Each structure stands twice: as structure tokens, then as C-alpha cells.
Design a protein around this ligand. Structure first.
Ligand SMILES: *[C@@H]1O[C@H](CO)[C@@H](O)[C@H](O)[C@H]1NC(C)=O
Ligand SMILES: *[C@@H]1O[C@H](CO)[C@@H](O)[C@H](O)[C@H]1NC(C)=O
Ligand SMILES: *[C@@H]1O[C@H](CO)[C@@H](O)[C@H](O)[C@H]1NC(C)=O
Ligand SMILES: *[C@@H]1O[C@H](CO)[C@@H](O)[C@H](O)[C@H]1NC(C)=O
Ligand SMILES: *[C@@H]1O[C@H](CO)[C@@H](O)[C@H](O)[C@H]1NC(C)=O
Ligand SMILES: *[C@@H]1O[C@H](CO)[C@@H](O)[C@H](O)[C@H]1NC(C)=O
Lengths: 319, 172, 319, 172, 319, 172
């Protein structure tokens, strides 16, 4: 009555600490980190379509500022907008800036469809020294600066586009704010000016505001940009007695808008990944990440903790 | 753990047990040996890989969301935007913290339980031919050569073969 | 030494699959579905008060458009607004449309209290061909279209209502936007027009905007609707030199606003339920539902999964 | 499960056991029989119905909320409205997924445990008069007629009645 | 064969009820309440910096209303704003009221830096009977009421401040709305008036609105307050032809804005706590509280339940 | 609980046991006594204080948030502000409800388990010298004076001292 058989389990020299409900440091044999805390120093151009705006942010890209020609026809899942982007045209603002930028980014493409607007008497294609292309005075190539005729005339404009296509149209137009009354009359005869753009169910009316603004690229005037969306079976009416920065057409809107925009300085590389943060792409299978709340694509969920170890083994009690 | 085997009546683990999570260590007249137990090892591995696969599961496929970084304060709407994201992050961080604590608590109980099931399996095979020494070991009250030990490990041990010899050793 | 007693458990031929932490398909003897994935093809008029807007959405109901008379005095927990509703009056917009609609719906009743406004010199009760009732030219029956006297006069209006009641008042008023300068002078003499409505602590000033809009029911003009809330112990002042679409009184506001609105085409039936989705009412005790995020009342929580089985029995190992 | 009874040393369940969750199956000189055990069955049922009632509990009584469907994009405020609802839905879907997995894990452990408690109850009643055969069955080392079997099932079995007979059968 | 040893556990006469997954009332030996449901009847001035606005809310504090002098130089973690606060100056509104209040509160200090504005010809320091200090007609001491010269002149103002400091500046300015055309010409000659304030990248243009408002402290006019933020390296331009309520300088903005505001009538006492609700400070280690969703500082999380007992002992089965 | 000791085969607790959570109660020829068991008591206390410290842990350090009380309705933005806070509160209330139910379920299982580990420890010390009476008590089949009882309680009991006497009492 002397043989012995012992039942037991494995152990290693040094295991990993994990937390339970009861204990914040239990040593187990193996564990798996669930928080991704490393990123790639680059954005992966695959399998998502990235489009690099480079020196143009997406508003300037949409307006057609100098340097933004490379974004013509561009299609994207994620628009990569650079923080060191620069204004290269006439000084402007957008009253609902973030909303226009959201709509543009979400839509996911720059597909511009030109139209001819039969403007009456006024001179078209007004340019500026603040918006040089090649050198040589120019303007937003999606906009049309209307100024008075050589006979010093600017009559009421009353123009209509009807949408019989199968897609909603995005019209971008602007209103010019002169510095002085003299600047006003020199450009549009009348004083005050005014614009009214309307669809069947909506409208927008703007009174220009004359006054001295800070000098920006040798200009104290400002343009304020607006937009109008024209559904299939709807139509748009342009009404003005001055100061209208007219559109040269419309952007096409996808019925399904599934795209977005990411603001970062990170370079686009050659790797493959479906998850992008403003610090770079993540290449991981972990369920969580602490790298950035700004994340786009098929990503781990963002959390505050730097580490969360899942036990994948029994308690480690060596000897 | 709940069963008190691992870090319980099993004093420690075996660093020499390198081809299994659980196993047998014996001593008889021919010598000593350590062998892995496949069934118990596999049962523990399956349950843990099962947690793993349910864990490393789910999408989070998001594109157009909201702004989350701001140069200067704007007021009402920016406050809400920041408060929404901050609320989300706290709730998901709490989920992750609790999840890992629950899973780990459960993982330790599962591995402790599988250790105990192995011990109880062998106790039941041995019937009246052996006594629990209290440290996860059984004293076997009959000669048990290498074939006998192996029959215990692969579950073919027939206790009636040795019962007369073992009873006599235990009680007289 | 030969009798035997065996301890055991039940089993059935075929059990149900459920998920655990460790296993995504474990067979158990019985289980209970926790996600409601069936709805009724109707809305239950009990025990919640539903009010069917039919051809009038809630804005048109509040303004008093033709066809909306059935909503007079109406009281609701949930306002049922139909997607095939139609405009039947003068073409209008609401600058803060969703906010007015929210306030109306939340308040939960259409209790209109008429008041007489002692308007000076101007002609009242202006009507239109775009707003036919019975045929015969009419208007929003809660609004009063003020136009110039027959002596071609429209003097400054300066009218005040004081609130000495025990409830907050909702005043709805509008501003007319003519198509041409001729239309402007033909209706209100002056040019420009203008309206200022104010309480002790708030105000709203509107300059009319003249211009051609798309033709809607033979009209190119537009009315823009606004609102003012007058607390007990406060008062409201109407100031105009033209274009004011005056109120005929005020709506009563409940101190406690507990109601809402549901947009759906689903017919109201005869069943009993306290939970309504835009797809119909739910009749269930389950804690979750995957039918619609749009849910009103005493409802299961909405989730993405189509099924979640709770084990209500042991593992099933038959033979 | 954690105790290794159900789908463990109990090889399978009994489709013939239709008036209980747990029970007894015996063989003696008079014949065989299956009978339900009420106490263990009721303990399992109570715990499960208890989960059920705590689960099918809570309100969610909501009226005026926010818009959730949109014809066309508007920008900033609509983005936030969509992001808020999307965040809510993901968090509640996660809650439901985790809840059911936890409850089910626990339900299986509770039913496995109740099976084991029943077995251990009977082991303790039998004392030295019987031996565990290893499959959830006890070999009884004395004549045990229908009255004797029933006294075991309703907990009135007095082991001292049979101890002399059983000891002699076990060890000689 | 006769000695006995029994293994057992403790018990008490009466234990505490707790909930589990399976049971909503299990008696255990001890338990710990996790929901804090008691508050102090006071706010603790330590270790957070509280600043009591007393009779001035934070907007009035920023403008410099009579009675608000005690808030000069004030620095706070939490601004304590009282519900019984009173307007003591010229009747005003703020178009984006909550946003201005948020920005002020968040910034966490009232550090005003005076500047001299070289206004041309117009008379400065206009005061009013609605804004008495000491008795004797006064105004917001951070604002400068510009009125026409004694020679009945109000020329175009064109003034510029440049920011070469290391902090962003907050400029608060206003626009006056006269009751009548006579009031307009009596104060600013011209009719209409107008203001344009602009930075390099933003602007704000306001047309005054003439009309009778309810009488408030003997006035039917109103001032509308606006604000402009000037980043380092930016500049601000003031443009007006009338009605400008000019600033006397700017407020300093912290780069890091970490403060907030709490609206409550609760008195500040002498206790120590880092968690404040609108009902008073909490002094607790519990993880949750049911006292108020309005909580500031280092607080328990707010929940709906009045009690949640954590078992800290085994089941209690006495005898 | 899962192990069926507390409120199980241990019929009730001892109100007289005031310096421990678990302990021993004996009867021998010299008299009776109750003594606390330190190791099992401390193991339960540690696990519970451990939950406590992980629970009474975490910040929630928030300053500038959003408005949450409103005099009068405003519409769209106020609706969203109310819906966001209402969503947050419901999610955190659910977290708290579930947390406490899980912790309590687990606490009861931990204390039941520690009771069972103590019982099993003593069973293993006694070997063949004693029999389980079924109520958490062992019948000791040899004279066991106060020193003998204490050697059991502090784990120095040597079963071979008494084995001959106990075997003879059990089986003859
Ligand atoms: C021009 O305006 C008139 C009314 O002023 C309107 O009847 C007509 O349809 C408009 N035509 C175009 C081409 O816009
Ligand atoms: C993420 O966690 C790592 C450690 O795993 C830490 O070094 C890093 O700073 C964290 N990143 C953050 C907090 O953004
Ligand atoms: C009319 O306006 C004058 C000032 O223009 C004001 O004193 C008076 O109270 C107003 N009366 C009414 C009835 O609105
Ligand atoms: C809800 O789940 C059912 C299955 O239970 C599925 O058929 C249905 O499509 C789901 N509804 C959705 C996803 O809206
Ligand atoms: C005044 O305005 C003129 C243009 O109208 C501008 O050139 C000048 O810089 C301005 N000066 C100041 C001091 O604002
Ligand atoms: C908080 O809970 C207590 C009971 O613990 C209750 O009396 C009090 O009314 C609650 N406070 C609320 C619901 O605001």
C-alpha cells in the first residue's frame, strides 16, 4: 500500500498580472492584451479610398481655389484634410461652415456639372489680385463674379434652373461684402445690393454688409458663401440686384452618403488597413484602443485605459 | 478559485509539465513519471479560446461622426458635442473594465474547476483501492506497475482486479 | 451488494441553441427569446390618446389650414402625423421648423383662445386663391392677413396683449415676402415693410425679402412663420409698418408638456397597447426589440440583434 | 459546467423523466423505476424564474425624444443627432449581448450545481452502505426493497439499519 | 467512535436584504449602501474655488452692471450663480445667450484689461436712468455708450485693435435698438444705424431694429450684446454709423478653460468637499448618488435608484 | 450558493461565532467548544474587501458639461440636450443595477465556496478515522481529547496515530 499518483497542473517561472472582480493583481500563466496602444506612422490607402487634399482643405476644394485642381472628379471614403492647408483666393467666410464641410465630406465626391446661366447685361468672370493662378488675376473656378456692365448697368437678375435629373443637386453661391460705398457702386451700380435664392419649399435672402475688414491678401472685402440643395422635381431661382457671386453649375449628390473626412498631417503610405486615426492607421485585432477618440473605419473601440489584460491561462503558482 | 484545487489543496504547479495544462505524476516500484492529461487540458483550452473568439468579434464600423477637437470654445453646441463624446468614452471604458474583470474571474474559476474534475475523475476510477492524501495525491494500496499506472491515466483501470489486495492492505 | 440507485436529470429530443461567454452554440432544454421581432400592422388607440392628423401635418394643424378643422380642441399623448399629408394654403416656410413642430407636439393639445386685436385703419381678413376652402378664397383661420386700407393707407401698428392668466401663451404670427416691389406697394403701401414682436425679455425683428420664388399654387410670394411665448406676468407687443400676418389669438401651453409626435402611415386600429413604433404597435413582454429605433411609450429597448435567447433550462444531452 | 455532473460524470439525461428536472433511477430485486426529485427540481426552477422576473422588469417609458430619420443631410446638428442615437443603440445592444451571455453561463452552472447537490445529498445519506460507481450511480451493498429505495428518495433512510450487512458485503 | 467535530459559519439575529441575478431579496450578514442619498445643506468653499455671484448672474457680472463690482478680478473653479439675481441696468438681451454664458463660465476668470478707443467726434460715456449706481444715472462699466456730438454729428467710426499678446482676447460689444425714429435721430443722428465688427477670418454685422418694446425700468429700447474673440496674431475692426455700444477693453481668456458654473440658492459654508450639486455638496465615498443629475467636481455617478446594497458578507441563516 | 454548504447541508449559522466567519464546533469526552478558523475567514474577507476597493475606486471628475434644467421648451437643441442626459442616466443606472447583482451573486458563491473548502480541508486531514454525518459534521471514531481536537483545527493532526483504533471502531 505504497504507490502514489498525483494530479496537478502546469506552471511557468514568470506569468502575467491581470485583474479580477476581487483582485487587481493576479498572476496567470498566459494573458492577452486587449487595448491596442501602437499605431502605424502612416495612413493606409487600402482598402479604403483616401483622397489627399494636400494644400486645399475641403471647402477650398469645393469652391475651386487655386491649387485645388487635383481634386476635380475625386472620389473618397475618407477625405484627408491637412492642417497646414492655405487659403489662396479671395478672403471668405461660411456662415454655417461646419455644416457645409460636413455635407461635402459625407457626400464623398467632387463631381461638378457645368451649366450656363444666361445672366443679363452684367459682366461675368470677375477676377482678383488676391486670387492669383499662375500669377495672373483669377477667382474660384466654380464661382462667377458678376459685375456691372461697361455702360454702368446692373439690372435685376431672374434666373431659373429646374431639376429633372435623378439626383439631388448642390448649388454653391456667394455674396460679396464691399469695404466702402464707393467700392459698392464701382462694382454693382446699386446700393444696397441683395440676393435671394429659393426652391419651392425653402429660400435664403442676403443683404450685403459694407464696412472695413482687416486686410487679407490686399483686400478688406469679404465673400460669404451659402448653398442650396435641389431635389429631383424641384427647381432653384436666383434673384439679385447686386453682389451675387454666381455658381457655374452644381455638384452631384449621392443618394447614399457614406463618406467622411479626417484632419491629420500623417503621410499616406503603402500599407493595408481599414482603420484610421488622426495619428495614423491601426493594424490590429484587439477590441479596444487608447490611441485616439478620432477614429474612422473598421476600428477597435476607443477607451481611456492604456492596458487591459485578458487571462488566457490558469493561475501561475510555480515550483 | 471557487473549488480550492489550484492554489488550494494542490500546493503548486509543475514547471516540468510542458505538453499539457493538467496531468499525472506518479511513483511506483519501477520509478517516477509525469504525463499530460489531454481531455482536461483540451476542455480548458476550448472554453478560453471560446471567450477569445466571442471577444475579438464585433465590427465598430463607423465613418461620418462628429467633430471631437476644437481650436477655441464656441458655446452651447460645442459643449454638447464634447459632453456626448465624453459620455460615450466613459461608458465604453467602463464596459471594457468590467468585461475583462468578469472574464478573468470566470477564467480562473473554469481552470480551477477543470483541475478539480480531473482529480474527481481519478478518485472515482480508483474506488476503494486508494485513499486521498490531501495534496491532490492518492495513495494506492496495491502494486501498480507502469501498465497499471497507464490504465489509470487512460481510464481503463479496472478496480476489481486489485480490490482484494488493496482492501487487505488498507484495513489490516 | 447488488442494488443500484442512479442520480440524473431530464432531457428532450431537440433543445434550443443559446450563447454563453465561452460558447456561441450550446443546446439547452428550454429557452426564451428576449428580442421582440414581430409588430402589429396597426396602432392601438388604447390606453394612450392618439390623434390622427390625416391630411394635415402638425404645423398645418396649428396654423389652421383648410382641411385641418378636425384638429380643433384635439388632445393627445401621441400625435399621429401622416407622410402623405398635403399643403392646402398659402405657400410658407418656418425658419426654425423642427423647433416649432417639437414645441407643438410636446405640448400635446390644440386649445386656441381667440382675442380681438384692435388693428388701426388696415383691412383685415385678407384671403388668397392658393388657399381655397370649399372653393372660395380663404387663409389660415388662426392668422389674419393685414392689408392697406381702401384709402391706400397702412399706418404703424402698436398693439399690446398682457398675460394675467395662469398659463404661458403661444402666439403664432407670420411675415409676408412679396415677389415684386409692385406686389409690395399693392398690399402694404410702404416699402420696405417690417415687423417687431417683443416681450419684456425677448424680441424678434423681421425685414421682408422681395423676390421671385418658384410658383406654388399660383403664387411666387412666401410667408415665414414665427412664434412667441408669453409667460404669466409678461406681455407681448406687435410693431409693424407692413407685411405682418397677424395672429387671431394664442394657443394654451400646459405647464407640464409630456406628449410627442410619431410620423407613420400605419392605420389606427382597435387593439390595446402602450408601445408604438413607426411600423405599428408592439404587443410584448420581451425586454428588447429590433423593429425600430423610432419607438414611443412603454416599450422594449431597441437593439440591433434579431435574436437573443435566454436559457431557461439545463444543457440538453439526450438518450 | 463548473461541477462536471451534467455532461460530465452523468453521461446523459433521461428523456423519460417528464415530471421533474432531476430524479432517481434504481434497480433492485423487485425491478426498476424512475422518480422525480422535487426539492432539487424546485430549487433550479426558482432560480431561473427569478432571473426571468428580474429580466422582464423595467419600464423604458419614453415619449418626446429626438428625430431619428432624415430626408436630406443638414450638417452639424443632424450629425450630432445621428451620432447620439447611434451611440445609444450600440451601447444597449452591447448590454443585451453581455447580459444574455452572463445569465446563460450562470444558468448552466446553477443547473449543473443543483445536479451535483442532489448526488452529494444521497451520498451523505448512504454513508458506508454504498460506493460511488463513477457515473452518478451508487452500488448499494445490501438488499434494498421498494420501501428502502423510497426511504432514500424522501430522506428517511436510516443507514444504521443496514450497516452490518453492507460492511460485510463491501469488505469480505 | 463517538467524538464529533462540526464545521460551520457565523450568523446574526437580523441581516440586510440585497439583490442578486436570481433573487431580489436575499438576507446577508452585512451590506454596504452604494448610493449616496444625503447631501450637506451648504456648498464647500474648499478645496475648489467657489465665487458667489450673489445678486449678479454671470452675464451681468461680465458686462459690469451696478452691484457687480465685487466680481472684478474674480477667479473660480465653479461660479455660483443665484436664482434670485436681478437686472440692475439698461434692458438687454443676448442673441446667443447660453453660448456667451458658457464661454464666460468655462474660462473661469474676470480679468478685464482696459484699452483706449480713439472714437471720433461722438460723445462718450452715455448713461441712463434705468441703470442707477448710488442713484445717479450710469451704465455697464465695461461698455461705452456712444452718442452724437453736441454739433449733432455722428461720423463713420473705423477703429482697429491688434493682438500681439500671448493670449486670446474676448471683446464684448452691443447694439442699441431705439423705440422710435425720433429716439434714433436724437441719439445717433443717422437713420438707419449699423455696426460691423470683424477679424481676419470672421465678422458680425448688425442692423438696429426700431420699435416699441415693453417698458422695463422706464425704457422701451433694448441693447443686444455680441462678442468677438481675437486670437494672438489677429486683429479686430469696429465699423459703425450709429447705435454701437462700445467696449472699454477686453477680457483675458485662459488657454486652458477648465471651469464651470452652478445655478443654486444653497449657501456657501465652511465644510470641505470636492463634489457639488445644486442641492448642496456631497461628502461621501459611495460610487453612486441619486441626489441630482446636476453635479460638478469629483462626484459619485448619478443614478435613478434610491438604494443599491452591496453584500459584504455571507447569507444570514440564524439560530 | 453553488456548493450547497451555506443554507445547504449546513442547516444554519452560529450566532455564537463572534470572532470569525467560519469555525469549528466539537463534542468530546471533556466537553464542547466553538473556535473560529482564521484562514478561511481571512480568505473570504480578503476577496470581499477586494471587491470593495475595486468598487470605491474611480474618479468621475467633471466640470463644464451641459445645461440640464430648463424653464420653458425651446425645441430642437433643447430636445437633444435632454435626450442625451436622459440616455446617459439610464445607461449608468443599468450599469449600477447589474454590477451590484453580479457582485452579490458572486459574493454569495465565494462565501459558500470558502465554507465548503474548510469542510473539505478537515475531511482530508481525518482520512479513514472519521465519517461524514451529512450536516457538516464528522463522527470521529477514536478518543479525541482537547489536544487532539486542537491538532485538527491547526492542521497538525496525524491520522496514523489513531488509524488502528478508528478502523476497528468503524468496521467491527
Ligand atoms: C421672373 O420673375 C417673374 C415675376 O417677377 C416670374 O413670373 C417669372 O417666372 C420669372 N422668370 C424667370 C426666368 O425667373
Ligand atoms: C496608451 O497606453 C500606453 C501604454 O499601453 C501609453 O504609453 C500611452 O501613453 C497611452 N496613450 C494615450 C493615453 O493616449
Ligand atoms: C405705443 O408706442 C409708444 C411709444 O412709441 C408707447 O409709449 C406705448 O406704450 C405704445 N402703446 C401701445 C398700445 O402699444
Ligand atoms: C429582426 O429580427 C428578425 C429575426 O428575428 C429579422 O427577420 C428582421 O429582419 C429583423 N428586423 C430588422 C433587422 O429590422
Ligand atoms: C479705415 O478704413 C479704410 C478703408 O475704408 C482702411 O484702409 C483703413 O485701414 C481703416 N483704418 C482704421 C484705423 O480702421
Ligand atoms: C434618493 O433615495 C432616497 C432613499 O434612499 C429617497 O428618499 C429620495 O427621495 C431619493 N432622491 C431622489 C429620488 O431624488
Amino acid at each position: 500500500g505504497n504507490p502514489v499518483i498525483c494530479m496537478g497542473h502546469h506552471a511557468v517561472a514568470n506569468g502575467t498580472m491581470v485583474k479580477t472582480l476581487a483582485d487587481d493583481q493576479v498572476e496567470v500563466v498566459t494573458a492577452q492584451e486587449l487595448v491596442e496602444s501602437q499605431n502605424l506612422p502612416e495612413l493606409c490607402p487600402s482598402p479604403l479610398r483616401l483622397v489627399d487634399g494636400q494644400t486645399c482643405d475641403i471647402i477650398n476644394g469645393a469652391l475651386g481655389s487655386p491649387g485645388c485642381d487635383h481634386l476635380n472628379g475625386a472620389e473618397w471614403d475618407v477625405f484627408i484634410e491637412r492642417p497646414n492647408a492655405v487659403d489662396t483666393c479671395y478672403p471668405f467666410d461660411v456662415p454655417e461652415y461646419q455644416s457645409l464641410r460636413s455635407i461635402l465630406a459625407n457626400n464623398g465626391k467632387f463631381e461638378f456639372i457645368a451649366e450656363e446661366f444666361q445672366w443679363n447685361t452684367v459682366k461675368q468672370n470677375g477676377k482678383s489680385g488676391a486670387c492669383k493662378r499662375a500669377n495672373v488675376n483669377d477667382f474660384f473656378n466654380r464661382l462667377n463674379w458678376l459685375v456691372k456692365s461697361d455702360g454702368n448697368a446692373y439690372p435685376l437678375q431672374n434666373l431659373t434652373k429646374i431639376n429633372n435629373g435623378d439626383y439631388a443637386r448642390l448649388y454653391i453661391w456667394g455674396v460679396h461684402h464691399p469695404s466702402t460705398d464707393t467700392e459698392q457702386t464701382n462694382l454693382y451700380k446699386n446700393n444696397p445690393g441683395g440676393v435671394t435664392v429659393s426652391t419651392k419649399t425653402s429660400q435664403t435672402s442676403v443683404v450685403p454688409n459694407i464696412g472695413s475688414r482687416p486686410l487679407v491678401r490686399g483686400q478688406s472685402g469679404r465673400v460669404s458663401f451659402y448653398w442650396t440643395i435641389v431635389e429631383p422635381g424641384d427647381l432653384i431661382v436666383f434673384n439679385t440686384i447686386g453682389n451675387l457671386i454666381a455658381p457655374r453649375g452644381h455638384y452631384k449628390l449621392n443618394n447614399q452618403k457614406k463618406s467622411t473626412i479626417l484632419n491629420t498631417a500623417i503621410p499616406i503610405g503603402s500599407c493595408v488597413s481599414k482603420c484610421h486615426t488622426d495619428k495614423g492607421s491601426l493594424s490590429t485585432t484587439k477590441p479596444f484602443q487608447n490611441i485616439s477618440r478620432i477614429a474612422v473605419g473598421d476600428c477597435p473601440r476607443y477607451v481611456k485605459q492604456g492596458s487591459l489584460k485578458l487571462a488566457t491561462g490558469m493561475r501561475n503558482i510555480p515550483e | 478559485g471557487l473549488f480550492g484545487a489550484i492554489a488550494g489543496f494542490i500546493e503548486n504547479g509543475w514547471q516540468g509539465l510542458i505538453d499539457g495544462w493538467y496531468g499525472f505524476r506518479h511513483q511506483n516500484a519501477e520509478g517516477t513519471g509525469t504525463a499530460a492529461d489531454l481531455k482536461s487540458t483540451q476542455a480548458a483550452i476550448d472554453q478560453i479560446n471560446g471567450k477569445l473568439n466571442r471577444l475579438i468579434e464585433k465590427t465598430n464600423d463607423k465613418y461620418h461622426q462628429i467633430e471631437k477637437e476644437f481650436e477655441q470654445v464656441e458655446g452651447r453646441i460645442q459643449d454638447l458635442e464634447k459632453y456626448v463624446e465624453d459620455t460615450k468614452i466613459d461608458l465604453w471604458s467602463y464596459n471594457a473594465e468590467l468585461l475583462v474583470a468578469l472574464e478573468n474571474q470566470h477564467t480562473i474559476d473554469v481552470t480551477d474547476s477543470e483541475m478539480n474534475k480531473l482529480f474527481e475523475r481519478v478518485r472515482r476510477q480508483l474506488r476503494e483501492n486508494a485513499e486521498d492524501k490531501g495534496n491532490g495525491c492518492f495513495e494506492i494500496f496495491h502494486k501498480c506497475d507502469n501498465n497499471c499506472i497507464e490504465s489509470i491515466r487512460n481510464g481503463t483501470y479496472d478496480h476489481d482486479i486489485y480490490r482484494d489486495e488493496a482492501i487487505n492492505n488498507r484495513f489490516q
